[PDB]
Amino acid sequence: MKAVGLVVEYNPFHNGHLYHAQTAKLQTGCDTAVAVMSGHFLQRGEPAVVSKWARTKMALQSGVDLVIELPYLYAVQKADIFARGSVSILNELECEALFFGSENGDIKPFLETAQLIDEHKHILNDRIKEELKKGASYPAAAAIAFSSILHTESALDLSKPNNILGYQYVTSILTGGYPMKPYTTARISSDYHDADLPEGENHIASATSIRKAMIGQNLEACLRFLPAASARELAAYRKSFGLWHTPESYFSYLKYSLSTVTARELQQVYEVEEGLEHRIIRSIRKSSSYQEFMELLKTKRYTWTRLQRMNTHILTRTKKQDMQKLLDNDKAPYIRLLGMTKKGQAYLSEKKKALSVPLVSKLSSFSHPALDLDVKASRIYSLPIEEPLRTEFDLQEYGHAPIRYDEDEQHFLN
Amino acid sequence: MKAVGLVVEYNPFHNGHLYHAQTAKLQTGCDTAVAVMSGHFLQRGEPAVVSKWARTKMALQSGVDLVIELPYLYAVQKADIFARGSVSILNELECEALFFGSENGDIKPFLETAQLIDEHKHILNDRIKEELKKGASYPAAAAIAFSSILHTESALDLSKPNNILGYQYVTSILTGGYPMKPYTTARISSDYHDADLPEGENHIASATSIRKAMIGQNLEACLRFLPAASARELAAYRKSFGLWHTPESYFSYLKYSLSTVTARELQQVYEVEEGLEHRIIRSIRKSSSYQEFMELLKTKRYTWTRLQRMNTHILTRTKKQDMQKLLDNDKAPYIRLLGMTKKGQAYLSEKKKALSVPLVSKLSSFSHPALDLDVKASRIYSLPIEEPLRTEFDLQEYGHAPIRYDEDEQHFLN
């Protein structure tokens, strides 16, 4: 029984992702598609628009057989640590194939580059060395070492971060020695991100264009870009807990978070750079908005995205020592199963005995510091939900089973 | 030149808060009324229904010459600490008299009791001891030990806790050798707590009945119960920031605060007794209301006001060791000047040099952990206010000059 993995956050799930799952199985010749999805707070630092549980229900109907949660430990991180864990999870699950998105359909550039840098790394450390002692910044010296090699017609823009993402999968597979073949195909249209929604033809709009369309109070505008499942579930969550989640929703709790902190204690928050505690605390007070806050904070060392990531850790109150101890784990501490089809179920029961870490269906079954971090995330995730809807959502973390979908038509059994 | 001491939570300042002030200058013969006031978080643990800045104005126009903030430190406390600290500040301001309302107008049973109890303080600890190791609970031992002496038809009911407070004021003065002469006058009508607004004639309903009348969206139902000062001040507050501050309006921040905190962290919070913190995090997740939360919370070791104080310390993340740090001192950490009238000015001018501790108006002038706490507490107060009315509000603590009013009619010079 043969499976192909996907690294995702379905934010929301739409026709492109649906297309991914279709191509993936096809292109790799695997009957089973296993995704590792960012749960409530995603790689770029923001909150998911809708519960990871609802986003699961969408995937299972659109051709995803297993949905495993990508632990917060690995989810809110820049690409390299992100890819490390998710690929390790997809490796834990014995995926022979890995399917990722990019500008190209050509896996070769991804493969060949990964090797070159793997091959040259000693030079690159040492050529950084030479530059750094000329007084260059680290990222400058990096750019210099990295430009002495790699600058050629080989191209493959190493900022197009499907492309940025992909490099890091192959990297992690190769330095991890996974019996796993990476696959990729070109994407189609809306930009990478931004823009808006197209003219027709299920045109596969971006998750962002679709996001700010919902928040922007058109759920119909994005219809043509959402599978039957997606629209049905999105409105159903919006009816349920009465909100569309955005980063903006949590600003009050980020404001609160920094009211109750000591600057000494804030330096112990993950991704809070030394001394930044002051810029952080100085700014929050004069800040009405998430935006302005970022504005006052924004530095050269910090892109918007890393700040957002940081702000998330401030929000969940994740400590540098929490993190460092959990990252030094070489593999995922557990496999958290959000949902399964009958195919994934079977694949699982076929593969369960050989999982070197627990298979977590119900939370009662297991405890681990990285899971605590996953559960806390959920708690904070729900804050914008007005009571007692919040409290009712709060139950969705524990007693919630793997969501099991029936591909022979349409039964969620619970 | 003389001043009479007044310890107050104006929530809001009402027809009976105006009565006491006159009778203060009336009965004491002190030309100057000094009000030491808890600013944003009060003795039973509640937030003030309006900021300390507005309530200062209600009093400055009702015949109170000086408004001093009672630090959170003393303010959010049990009665014996509360009095200890508040009498402490009035003494540094050299009010020759202290004036406090009771159920009676009779300070004699107070002075009797206090001096009675101090005489027997060795006898008390002995029967407490004798009853305690006889297998009695502490309060039972306390209750029993006290009943054998001084219990008689001489009364002074010590649950009508005007008296509880008054006794502690009285006790504070003796025990500190303060040259403060106490006085007291009875309360007429609406209950003690709760009830309703009476049928007219400035009848002075309880502040509680007014809050519940305001909570129930009637300012005007209480109009005969409020001076013009205090009525109009409430209008502007609501009009500016869009709310009255209610305990549930802080409920969302309790769930956040309790969602990020470990059991050992929560153990370190002031008025969380050892072993309770698990019950706390247990109850908060399944409680869709502050009210629901409280019912799961109540043990016999805990009074419902003591439970409310704890929620606030939990809210402000105030720790035991810090508390013991600041409670350890026998004297006031600083004098925080909220507001004054002309007469008020004159008093301060006279006795400022006599002040043994810093006189703070602009927060620039002095810095201190006890003050860092007062600031934090205000920074927590405005959270229910909707942005950007929240960031405007927060600007006050620093920027605000001490309020200045002209007794001779109607001028805030500012």
Side-chain angles (χ1 to χ4, degrees):
Chain A
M1 208 166 170
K2 313 208 162 177
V4 41
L6 309 149
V7 185
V8 308
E9 332 141 339
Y10 285 147
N11 203 39
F13 186 99
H14 61 76
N15 283 339
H17 304 147
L18 160 70
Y19 172 53
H20 275 8
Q22 297 171 327
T23 330
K25 291 185 171 190
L26 197 170
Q27 199 137 319
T28 77
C30 307
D31 42 84
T32 307
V34 174
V36 64
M37 184 188 74
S38 297
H40 280 141
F41 289 98
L42 322 185
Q43 198 257 333
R44 284 79 163 167
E46 72 289 3
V49 230
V50 137
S51 77
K52 79 186 162 191
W53 300 106
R55 284 174 295 133
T56 299
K57 308 179 92 212
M58 303 190 198
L60 299 168
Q61 283 165 247
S62 282
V64 171
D65 302 291
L66 279 181
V67 167
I68 272 66
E69 178 176 17
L70 182 47
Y72 183 95
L73 178 58
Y74 300 120
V76 189
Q77 315 284 352
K78 55 166 173 51
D80 52 340
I81 295 169
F82 175 81
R84 199 195 88 210
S86 72
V87 175
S88 182
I89 297 173
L90 296 165
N91 177 60
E92 182 72 46
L93 295 164
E94 300 181 7
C95 302
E96 52 187 35
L98 170 70
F99 186 97
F100 66 81
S102 52
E103 52 174 334
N104 304 305
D106 222 313
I107 331 177
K108 206 192 185 178
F110 293 93
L111 311 196
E112 289 175 305
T113 301
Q115 177 225 29
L116 223 185
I117 309 182
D118 185 23
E119 217 162 338
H120 253 76
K121 244 315 175 181
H122 277 338
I123 285 195
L124 302 181
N125 312 135
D126 297 19
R127 179 60 193 303
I128 282 172
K129 168 196 301 188
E130 173 79 35
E131 293 307 324
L132 231 42
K133 63 169 107 114
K134 280 185 185 174
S137 72
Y138 172 81
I144 297 155
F146 262 178
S147 75
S148 65
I149 56 167
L150 310 156
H151 175 236
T152 165
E153 289 214 35
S154 85
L156 185 90
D157 335 338
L158 216 254
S159 38
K160 297 293 165 291
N162 288 333
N163 284 33
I164 255 293
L165 281 177
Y167 167 74
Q168 287 292 344
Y169 299 143
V170 170
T171 300
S172 290
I173 302 182
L174 242 199
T175 63
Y178 299 159
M180 193 169 316
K181 187 166 176 167
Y183 301 66
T184 183
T185 24
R187 84 292 268 247
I188 164 169
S189 55
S190 172
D191 309 343
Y192 178 96
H193 286 344
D194 323 270
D196 299 293
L197 323 171
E199 281 52 45
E201 289 79 34
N202 84 110
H203 210 185
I204 307 177
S206 69
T208 293
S209 59
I210 292 183
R211 260 188 300 281
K212 248 141 197 170
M214 291 184 305
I215 309 164
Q217 299 144 346
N218 274 262
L219 182 47
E220 281 94 327
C222 24
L223 271 175
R224 192 181 340 106
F225 322 96
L226 270 50
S230 281
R232 199 178 296 94
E233 186 64 25
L234 284 168
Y237 183 91
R238 174 54 220 265
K239 279 189 182 184
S240 277
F241 307 94
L243 74 162
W244 294 129
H245 308 241
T246 130
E248 200 60 47
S249 307
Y250 302 86
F251 188 59
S252 299
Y253 302 93
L254 169 65
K255 218 170 208 176
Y256 177 80
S257 184
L258 296 167
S259 289
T260 45
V261 78
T262 100
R264 227 202 66 269
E265 297 189 326
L266 177 67
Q267 173 57 24
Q268 265 314 285
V269 159
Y270 191 61
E271 298 261 35
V272 169
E273 119 185 338
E274 174 206 347
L276 188 67
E277 64 238 51
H278 305 108
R279 197 202 183 99
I280 293 180
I281 280 167
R282 181 188 76 241
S283 326
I284 190 56
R285 287 156 174 182
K286 338 178 217 173
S287 243
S288 42
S289 99
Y290 196 59
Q291 156 75 355
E292 309 191 315
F293 179 50
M294 306 284 287
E295 293 186 350
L296 317 185
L297 270 204
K298 218 299 194 185
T299 37
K300 288 159 81 171
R301 279 172 307 237
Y302 281 91
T303 24
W304 305 35
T305 148
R306 181 188 183 190
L307 285 183
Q308 178 170 125
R309 273 208 285 275
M310 183 183 83
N311 294 337
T312 287
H313 301 296
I314 295 165
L315 195 39
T316 69
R317 291 265 189 131
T318 303
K319 301 144 192 148
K320 291 173 172 165
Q321 270 172 38
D322 291 347
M323 261 301 167
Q324 285 311 320
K325 297 177 191 176
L326 296 179
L327 291 183
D328 306 348
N329 203 23
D330 40 319
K331 68 186 184 185
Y334 58 77
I335 298 308
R336 162 77 140 165
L337 173 74
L338 306 188
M340 46 175 156
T341 56
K342 309 140 66 176
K343 176 90 69 60
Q345 194 285 125
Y347 183 79
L348 254 175
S349 287
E350 166 149 329
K351 301 287 189 187
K352 185 194 177 189
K353 248 304 173 178
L355 300 190
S356 51
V357 298
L359 168 85
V360 178
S361 310
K362 306 314 303 294
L363 275 198
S364 63
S365 59
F366 193 46
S367 299
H368 190 275
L371 183 50
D372 291 358
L373 184 44
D374 274 338
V375 168
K376 170 169 58 168
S378 291
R379 274 127 171 71
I380 278 77
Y381 183 76
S382 54
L383 296 180
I385 312 181
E386 272 178 318
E387 222 85 29
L389 304 173
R390 175 202 276 148
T391 302
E392 190 172 338
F393 179 97
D394 267 346
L395 315 183
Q396 226 186 344
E397 185 60 55
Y398 289 86
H400 216 160
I403 292 158
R404 331 164 60 102
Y405 183 49
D406 191 337
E407 313 115 281
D408 301 281
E409 203 36 87
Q410 199 38 70
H411 308 296
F412 289 100
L413 5 123
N414 271 331
Chain B
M1 175 187 197
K2 314 171 153 187
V4 45
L6 303 167
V7 199
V8 279
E9 304 186 330
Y10 287 139
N11 207 12
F13 189 112
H14 49 76
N15 277 9
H17 276 143
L18 173 137
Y19 169 74
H20 278 355
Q22 302 185 18
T23 307
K25 298 189 197 187
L26 192 164
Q27 174 177 351
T28 69
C30 289
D31 24 72
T32 298
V34 188
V36 60
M37 196 185 57
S38 9
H40 287 149
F41 279 101
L42 313 192
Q43 193 253 341
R44 306 153 207 72
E46 63 254 346
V49 175
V50 133
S51 102
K52 57 192 180 192
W53 305 113
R55 309 184 307 120
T56 298
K57 300 187 151 202
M58 312 178 186
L60 287 198
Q61 311 166 35
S62 293
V64 165
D65 300 310
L66 256 169
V67 186
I68 276 72
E69 172 166 17
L70 191 69
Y72 176 107
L73 161 68
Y74 305 119
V76 190
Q77 286 296 357
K78 46 198 200 64
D80 85 316
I81 297 184
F82 175 83
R84 198 194 90 217
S86 26
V87 168
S88 202
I89 290 180
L90 292 176
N91 188 66
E92 172 70 50
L93 287 155
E94 306 196 348
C95 312
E96 50 182 45
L98 176 51
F99 180 59
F100 62 90
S102 54
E103 32 132 1
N104 345 306
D106 205 339
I107 15 163
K108 188 175 182 172
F110 287 72
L111 295 180
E112 285 182 330
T113 317
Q115 195 208 2
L116 249 180
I117 285 167
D118 184 21
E119 174 151 6
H120 301 56
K121 238 319 166 191
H122 289 341
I123 301 191
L124 284 165
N125 299 337
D126 285 358
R127 173 76 171 284
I128 290 158
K129 176 176 296 193
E130 197 79 15
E131 295 308 305
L132 208 56
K133 44 176 169 58
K134 256 173 188 175
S137 47
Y138 183 81
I144 281 204
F146 275 90
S147 52
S148 69
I149 45 139
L150 311 6
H151 158 234
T152 164
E153 23 150 349
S154 90
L156 185 58
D157 314 345
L158 277 208
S159 58
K160 303 290 169 311
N162 285 326
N163 309 340
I164 283 286
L165 293 178
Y167 169 75
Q168 294 307 329
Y169 303 151
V170 164
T171 290
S172 291
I173 297 174
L174 286 180
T175 49
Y178 304 149
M180 205 163 312
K181 184 166 180 168
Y183 302 111
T184 196
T185 46
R187 159 258 334 168
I188 169 187
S189 111
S190 137
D191 300 21
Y192 176 86
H193 250 357
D194 309 11
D196 285 276
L197 342 155
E199 272 49 30
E201 278 58 32
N202 73 266
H203 207 14
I204 310 170
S206 40
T208 341
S209 24
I210 307 186
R211 292 196 307 251
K212 273 87 200 197
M214 271 185 317
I215 294 157
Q217 298 167 318
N218 273 253
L219 189 59
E220 305 74 15
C222 343
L223 279 182
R224 239 175 297 91
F225 307 93
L226 252 69
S230 314
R232 99 237 319 166
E233 228 58 36
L234 291 161
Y237 191 92
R238 174 73 205 254
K239 283 178 183 187
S240 279
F241 315 121
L243 89 173
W244 308 124
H245 296 249
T246 142
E248 175 80 355
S249 54
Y250 294 84
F251 179 54
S252 279
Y253 303 98
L254 204 63
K255 200 162 282 204
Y256 168 81
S257 177
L258 290 179
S259 269
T260 56
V261 92
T262 80
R264 293 200 47 185
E265 293 163 16
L266 185 47
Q267 166 46 224
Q268 305 319 317
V269 178
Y270 182 68
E271 290 296 273
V272 178
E273 81 163 15
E274 136 241 356
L276 177 60
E277 56 266 14
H278 316 92
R279 186 155 190 161
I280 299 182
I281 319 157
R282 237 151 62 215
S283 291
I284 184 57
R285 264 56 174 274
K286 54 173 175 176
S287 298
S288 49
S289 67
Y290 193 98
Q291 135 73 3
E292 274 197 14
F293 187 43
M294 294 282 270
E295 284 202 13
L296 308 177
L297 278 193
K298 179 213 185 178
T299 43
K300 298 164 75 184
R301 260 185 293 244
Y302 276 89
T303 119
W304 278 62
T305 55
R306 179 196 181 197
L307 291 173
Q308 239 172 228
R309 283 193 299 274
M310 183 191 54
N311 279 335
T312 297
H313 300 321
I314 281 184
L315 218 53
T316 60
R317 296 200 203 217
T318 289
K319 298 172 218 167
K320 311 178 167 171
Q321 182 203 111
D322 317 333
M323 267 303 177
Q324 297 323 311
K325 276 182 181 172
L326 302 179
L327 291 171
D328 231 86
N329 195 11
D330 69 339
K331 68 127 85 182
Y334 49 80
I335 299 302
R336 179 77 166 92
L337 169 76
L338 295 195
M340 64 196 172
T341 77
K342 345 185 63 181
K343 184 87 60 64
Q345 264 239 268
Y347 202 74
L348 266 197
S349 313
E350 178 161 317
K351 314 211 173 180
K352 168 165 194 170
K353 281 286 195 193
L355 295 195
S356 57
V357 296
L359 169 53
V360 195
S361 310
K362 301 297 305 306
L363 274 193
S364 76
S365 54
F366 185 52
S367 87
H368 191 296
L371 208 37
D372 295 340
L373 187 28
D374 297 345
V375 182
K376 184 170 55 175
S378 297
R379 216 144 248 67
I380 283 144
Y381 193 68
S382 55
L383 289 164
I385 303 186
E386 282 191 319
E387 211 66 55
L389 309 150
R390 187 195 302 142
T391 309
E392 179 179 353
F393 181 106
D394 296 336
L395 236 171
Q396 293 163 118
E397 204 83 356
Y398 277 85
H400 202 345
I403 302 172
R404 321 164 76 87
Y405 184 63
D406 197 315
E407 306 174 294
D408 305 286
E409 199 38 277
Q410 192 41 53
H411 260 317
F412 283 101
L413 353 147
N414 285 125

